[PDB]
Design a protein around this ligand. Structure first.
Ligand code: ADP
Lengths: 250, 214, 323, 109, 323, 323
């Protein structure tokens, strides 16, 4: 880990040049030293505040929502310094972290970040209040290149099917909870009870991790299969029978 | 009317977004309640059709048992009608719950105060006893039918009310909030435009003043 | 104001200093007031003391900054504030902290800043409030609904937060070992109540499960008689943390035991329900409600702890009789 | 306290229901049944049926299909559910699913 | 990607050019990408060719335009976009068209712009999408919902549209006379199925008339066996228009003849039903479903046309026998 | 147009004086037009006349001020208007009040400034409309929905107001003594109907109380047949105040009778409802509706008053025969 810290009370111009320092080091290590670099940029909202300050100092008029008009170009300059390249064995994965102001996904910073990046991992206030760690919401979250990230020889044969079935069962479990809120526990069917059970155990075993619990992706998939074995083979409609016959048993 | 008439502001926008989400969630929950009520309503409708078909046979059997009774016992209808005394079979109200809607139903209950014993002591006998049993069976069928029809009517009314609620929401309230949010966004854009114009004017004046000093 | 120190009542002025600045005083002095206060606090921190600083309104400080920026003819950021408002707020707040003070005689001082923010019409997107939330580690947000209902303190426990819980785990796990699970369960209960109230008022209260009823009524109990504190009464002016932890322990013990009874008797002939529990032990609920009335001044710490233990014993006995 | 069952049908059906044990005489000695003879007319059937519905302890009411057709307007006017009205067959006229007051609420049949 | 020309599998890059730029490129480059592409397309049009320009996302170009406007400090128009977004989009799309190329050798080239737009969260109300829809004449409306349902291509065939039908009426009447009525009947069938989708919920499928059932069960046939098409297979990766019109003609002939049978047996006691038709002609429905699998290459145009004519003969024979 | 003076018809152009500056005429001339109009009105007031100055659009004057300010590069107020627009409007309106004209012969002039406003987009938050509502004592806000329904005059009876009612009750109690209670009851009816309509829009009329139904129907009658007035007809172009009060009196009397009947027969078995009232009084309701069709000129004042009295007698007799 190479750690660049820009404290809130440090110069905002230093805040501006911090991500460029980090990504220059990442480019050196990845495209010259040929090692896969993960760049974790924390508080792009604070970076945007520094950018706003520098624009005002330049005496440029505020743009949308008081932010610079070129903030999209600046955020693109930061983010797009990432990815694999031809003829080099290194790469730069990026995980910018944003503090959505007022929890408004339409705010310029998260909006342009979604325009430039390739996914989002949502941290849910509801889960945080329910005291689940990590409070990552998997329904609104997305990773466009999960299909490239997973598969045989990269993670495992059944990663995509397990992930899809887990998402489907989780959404159905939330729906069944909403329905139970109206009809009552008795009116629910056996499949509804199974879905509620899977929802509970998925938020208690899959999501709920603990700060210092390092799960290899194989452990993650084993937990996912433990949760999927709540249901019989038939209700797992999103897992091909070829994969169910191999990983469902036990 | 078209708008809720909340003054444009970021606080107003947040309030209206929260209200829109709440209205959508309530609409979804009421739609689920309507779906449950409609499912139970159609189940009871099919049960009613089946029970009517089965009555088509039970009532016929009871009537033919009566016709056979009149073969041996003779004209016992007048005796049966005259000696009423006290009902041997009464009904007890019961409650049934579907979603939040309570469905009235009936209970088949006996009193034991028989009053037609010995009615065919000399001639009727077996035929009248069989007729009594057949009409007790018919009453057992028709009490279930009555409970089904009462639940059916209650479910019909509740379904209509809940569908009216859902339609009212999604045709009046949600459009109102959506229009309010659109207007608020437009007005905030207008505020941003006015502030931009003022700042640009000030910058132009500052440039002119700098030139004047130079 | 007076406080009991070493068995004597001494004026608060003997250890408090005030930096007053009315709204009509010059805006430059209004801008320098916060800095003067924090410098005095830093001096007394370097002394080796713990200095609690209270800024009556950083919103008025931000207004002063905005007016001075306008007078200087600078380009503002969103909502007219200077684009360096966040930087100034950080330079003020980050002067807080616990420090090994300078100087050879070893000592550890601290400055604890409590800055007040009053946005226009309770705005959460206010620039000063956003800049503050980007710096401060604790935020006791305001519930306008609770304020209107006269539920004091009016803290909105759903968006208010404190990031010092992790650092306080060491302190709790050595002095109040049992308090962390109580806090976790209380927060879970409150969130479940928040999720259930919507369904209750959208659709109806008839479809609720027995466990949902336990959650709702325990949430009402906690909100009304653990999160509701009247600061003008002799008994609730200051609630010792031993009192707080004991109360929360009793409330969460009741929650867990009632839920255990309900769930265990579910799928059984002798089913237990919230109505049965309440009808049986309305006295226990009343005692839990009156727990907030214990007065540390006359009801010593030992007396309060013994009373709460007696309440726990009565709860256990009543639930044993129920079971 | 529990409700009763009421019958409006031909003498044979009424006799069968009485054997089933449905009739009683209350404190004021009012019967809860009627035999529809030829001497009885539509106005009489309507009046007795209205008395039946108004009575709060009647519960279930049974009517032959042809009697229900004769007094159909009252059946349609009666909308509340508790006085559970049923249409039953008879030897004189068969029962048909169509044109039933309760089934009037159904189009999926 | 490769294309078969003159029996040889060439590479489409022998005829394709890529004006490719990312989001960290100069904003001027991003904003002038569309103009460079349309100018190159116009050049190859003037050369006498038919060019197809495809902007990947005109929304990003519009964002670059808004960024340029902000940099120049121009007044922000509707939702922050410049004061000329509609003019720029209209003038760019005006460059598409079919022309009598300038020059002595009599030529006629064309430039077809298929520029795609990105509606915020599926909303077609933002300035860029609104202007694009107003200017363009076709909208192919791909749907993630159908993609999830595995209906490829995912064109929603309900929000899509095309305003060139009246322009191509002449071409169809000259070459594919029947295609226009076939297409109108298919569109009306799909609209009727969409309308009946609501009725099915209200009263179920058992309450549907025989005409409604035939409409539903030919709408399903068109959806799953005509609109649905897999680009990977060797038989229907590319569907010649003669094959397409043949399939549509066979499907609409089935629909019309089934509707005629139902209507003309409604008056008899032995009324025909969709169930009767399906039971009698499960083979014909299977053949209609299997009309996809005719390979345009191996099964030449003549063979495919003859097979479809034989299929129509079989349908006519079966319907005549049943009626 | 003519007005009778001492039995001789004399044209009203003999007293009207126009000051025309159309939209395309120079923009800077609109302020001069307003000031010339008000000065002429003041001049004729000083003679002892009750002048009435119709400002056709003060919004156009405000826009002219905005254009001149923009040319002067002044710093704008809300929505680009100058910072002195409100002061200018206040100074212009302050020239209206009834006066004791100057000079030796004691007189009493007046200048009633009736000033139309033209909010852009129909938004009354417009700076011009807001500043005008901050000055004018009567606000006749018009409604675009009513205008579209052709409900002319399109005045919105809810928002509209007049701050002269208390100052005019002195004159009403002596000239039209029976009008103030009628006005109060009509406003009550309209407000109650507004509340009941807000309720009905979401719930429907199924649960409405019968008196609420009568309120709704009488309010519909008042709207469609008292408030709205076709100004381009021989009968409704001018509605004398005897007509304005007689129509209201008849409608309010019918309301009182219907409410009395329903309320006093709610307990009894012969429950009178709105349906019974409407069926029995279809003719009387139509007469109330057509009361507006009385011609003040073709039919004399005596005839109109006699006909309204006869309609009142018909209402009374019909209600008595109904009850
Ligand atoms: N009292 C009225 N009677 C009948 N029609 C009216 C009345 N007032 C307005 N209208 C209708 O409203 C329309 C607009 O009138 P006008 O006031 O000239 O427009 P604006 O409101 O733009 O000044 C006219 O065409 C006219 O038909």
């Amino acid at each position: 880990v190479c750690l660049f810290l820009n404290l809130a009370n440090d110069p905002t111009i230093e805040r501006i040049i911090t991500p460029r320092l980090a990504l220059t080091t990442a480019e050196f290590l990845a495209y010259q030293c040929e090692k896969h670099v993960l760049v974790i940029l924390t508080d792009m909202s604070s970076y945007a505040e520094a950018l706003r300050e520098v624009s005002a100092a330049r005496e440029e008029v505020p743009g949308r929502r008081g932010f610079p008009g070129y903030m999209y170009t600046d955020l693109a300059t930061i983010y797009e310094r990432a990815g694999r390249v031809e003829g080099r064995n290194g790469s730069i994965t990026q995980i910018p972290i944003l503090t959505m102001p007022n929890d408004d996904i339409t705010h310029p910073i998260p909006d342009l970040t979604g325009y430039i990046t390739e996914g989002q991992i949502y941290v849910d206030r509801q889960l945080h209040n329910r005291q689940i760690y990590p409070p990552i919401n998997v329904l609104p979250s997305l990773s466009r290149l999960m299909k490239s990230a997973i598969g045989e020889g990269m993670t495992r044969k059944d990663h995509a099917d397990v992930s899809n079935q887990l998402y489907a069962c989780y959404a159905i479990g939330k729906d069944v909870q909403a329905m139970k809120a109206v009809v009552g526990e008795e009116a629910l069917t056996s499949d509804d009870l199974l879905y509620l059970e899977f929802l509970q155990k998925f938020e208690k075993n899959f999501i709920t991790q603990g700060p210092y619990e390092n799960r290899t992706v194989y452990e993650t998939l084993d937990i996912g299969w433990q949760l999927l074995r709540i249901f019989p083979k038939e209700m797992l409609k999103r897992i091909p029978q070829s994969t169910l016959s191999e990983f469902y048993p036990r | 009317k078209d708008r809720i008439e909340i003054f444009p502001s970021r606080m107003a926008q947040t309030i209206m977004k929260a209200r829109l989400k709440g209205a959508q969630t309530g609409r979804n929950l009421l739609k689920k309640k309507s779906d449950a009520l409609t499912l139970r309503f159609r189940q009871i409708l099919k049960k009613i059709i089946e029970t009517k078909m089965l009555m088509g046979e039970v009532m016929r059997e009871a009537a033919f048992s009566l016709a056979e009774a009149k073969f041996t016992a003779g004209d016992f209808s007048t005796t049966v009608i005259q000696n009423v005394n006290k009902a041997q079979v009464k009904i007890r109200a019961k409650k049934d719950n579907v979603a939040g809607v309570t469905l009235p139903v009936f209970e088949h209950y006996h009193e034991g105060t028989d009053s037609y014993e010995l009615t065919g002591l000399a001639r009727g006998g077996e035929q009248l006893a069989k007729l009594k049993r057949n009409y007790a069976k018919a009453v057992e069928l028709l009490v279930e039918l009555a409970s089904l029809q009462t639940s059916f009517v209650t479910l019909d009314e509740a379904i209509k009310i809940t569908n009216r609620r859902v339609n009212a929401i999604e045709h009046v309230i949600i459009p109102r909030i959506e229009r309010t949010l659109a207007y608020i966004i437009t007005e905030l854009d207008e505020r941003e435009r006015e502030e931009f114009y003022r700042l640009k004017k000030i910058q132009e004046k500052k440039k002119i003043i700098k030139e004047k000093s130079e | 104001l007076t406080m009991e120190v070493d068995g004597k009542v001494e004026s608060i002025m003997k250890r408090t200093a005030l930096v007053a600045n009315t709204s009509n005083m010059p805006v430059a002095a209004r801008e320098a007031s916060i800095y003067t206060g924090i410098t005095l606090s830093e001096y007394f921190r370097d002394m080796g003391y713990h200095v609690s600083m209270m800024a009556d309104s950083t919103s008025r400080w931000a207004e002063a900054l905005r007016e001075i920026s306008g007078r200087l003819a600078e380009m503002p950021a969103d909502s007219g504030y200077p684009a360096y408002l966040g930087a100034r707020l950080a330079s003020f707040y980050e002067r807080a902290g616990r420090v090994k003070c300078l100087g050879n005689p070893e000592r550890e001082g601290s400055v604890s800043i409590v800055g007040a923010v009053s946005p226009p019409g309770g705005d959460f997107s206010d620039p000063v409030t956003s800049a503050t939330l980007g710096i401060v580690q604790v935020f006791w947000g305001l519930d306008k609904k609770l304020a209107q209902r006269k539920h004091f303190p009016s803290v909105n426990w759903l968006i208010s937060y404190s990031k010092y819980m992790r650092a306080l785990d060491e302190y709790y796990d050595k002095h109040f070992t049992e308090f962390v699970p109580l806090r976790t369960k209380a927060k879970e209960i409150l969130q479940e109540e928040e999720d259930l109230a919507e369904i209750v008022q959208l659709v109806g209260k008839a479809s609720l499960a027995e466990t949902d009823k336990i959650t709702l009524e325990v949430a009402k109990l906690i909100k009304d008689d653990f999160l509701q504190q009247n600061g003008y009464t002799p008994y609730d002016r200051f609630c010792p943390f031993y009192k707080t932890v004991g109360m929360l322990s009793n409330m969460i013990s009741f929650y867990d035991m009632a839920r255990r009874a309900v769930e265990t008797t579910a799928q059984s002939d002798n089913k237990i329900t919230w109505s049965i529990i309440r009808e049986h032990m309305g006295e226990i609920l009343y005692k839990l409600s009156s727990m907030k009335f214990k007065d540390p001044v006359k009801d010593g710490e030992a007396k309060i702890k013994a009373d709460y233990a007696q309440l726990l014993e009565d709860m256990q006995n009543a639930f044993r009789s129920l079971e | 306290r529990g409700k009763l069952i009421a019958v409006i049908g031909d003498e044979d059906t009424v006799t069968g229901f009485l054997l089933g044990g449905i009739g009683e005489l209350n404190k004021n000695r009012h019967p809860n049944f009627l035999v529809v003879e030829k001497d009885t007319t539509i106005n009489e059937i309507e009046d007795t049926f209205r008395q039946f519905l108004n009575r709060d302890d009647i519960g279930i009411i049974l009517i032959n299909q042809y009697i229900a057709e004769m007094v159909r307007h009252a059946l349609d006017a009666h909308q509340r559910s508790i006085p559970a009205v049923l249409e039953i067959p008879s030897k004189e006229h068969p029962y048909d699913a169509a044109k039933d007051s309760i089934l009037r609420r159904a189009k999926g049949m």
